[PDB]
């Protein structure tokens, strides 16, 4: 597959892509205004919301959050190791962004006002599409036709552009968000598998039922302006398996089309 149409045909299901070449503003799109269940990709928006709170409350990132074992929800590989020690707010942000740790996101949402606070933060950065309705791990049900916990590829690309490359955050907080995204450890087979050698990547993956396979981030070529890329993918059967290679190929197609 070398077009989004061919990729969606080969893979089955529904593929959504928005990639923006920031040198020109040109976009390559597929189903870019359709809603998709964002799954863990929202953790980029959550990390930004926490960073914004750290501007109004200096020192917030260094505050130690403690929690009991009974706070832990499914898929918490980092937080389950730190009941004794606690984790700083910054460590929770890194854990939920780089590993998709579920409890880390819930602890951060408890600190800032719940799912509604993440949605309100999205509105504050110009995103009138994103909606976070549920806590981890319910928000990954990915039901067809369900508006809960959805965004569009175009909206998430626009939000990542202003957060990572624009000035939605001050420079120091922006640099911290970039480093969290750069250190993603669970996206090797997705966007990162589709970029040329020497390109730097920061991204956030997500996975859910209906074989939902997502990844959104920013790509830095060595000699060109960055590309913002949001890929969402979901399938017909509730039991479908995630398809990492669909994301890798969509990334290659997006880059080839913009090049």
């Amino acid at each position: 597959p070398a077009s989004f149409a061919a990729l969606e045909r080969a893979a089955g299901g529904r593929l959504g892509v928005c990639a923006i070449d920031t040198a020109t503003g040109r976009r390559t799109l597929h189903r870019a205004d359709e809603r998709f269940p964002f799954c863990s990709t929202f953790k980029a928006m959550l990390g930004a919301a926490v960073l914004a709170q750290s501007v109004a409350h200096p020192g917030l990132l260094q505050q130690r959050v403690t929690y009991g074992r009974s706070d832990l929800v499914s898929y918490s590989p980092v937080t389950e190791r730190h009941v004794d020690t606690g984790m700083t707010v910054a460590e929770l942000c890194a854990a939920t962004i780089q590993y998709s740790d579920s409890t880390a996101a819930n602890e951060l949402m408890k600190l800032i006002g719940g799912p509604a606070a993440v949605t309100a933060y999205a509105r504050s950065i110009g995103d009138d599409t994103f909606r976070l309705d549920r806590w981890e791990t319910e928000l990954n049900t990915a039901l067809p036709g369900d508006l809960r916990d959805t965004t569009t590829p175009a909206a998430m690309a626009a939000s990542l552009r202003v957060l990572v490359l624009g000035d939605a955050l001050p420079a120091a907080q922006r640099a911290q968000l970039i480093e969290w995204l750069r250190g993603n450890k669970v996206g090797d087979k997705r966007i990162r598998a589709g970029v040329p050698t020497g390109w730097r990547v920061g991204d956030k993956t997500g996975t859910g039922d209906y074989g939902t396979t997502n990844d959104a981030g920013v790509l830095w070529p060595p000699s060109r302006a960055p590309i913002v890329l949001a890929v969402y993918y979901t399938q017909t059967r509730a039991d479908a398996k995630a398809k990492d290679d669909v994301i890798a190929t969509a990334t290659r197609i997006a880059i080839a089309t913009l090049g």
Binding site: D128, F130, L147
Partner: peptide, 12 residues
């Protein structure tokens, strides 16, 4: 449009 923003904000 104003309806698009309203849908994003509406209860399910």
């Amino acid at each position: 449009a104003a309806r698009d923003a309203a849908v994003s904000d509406a209860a399910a």
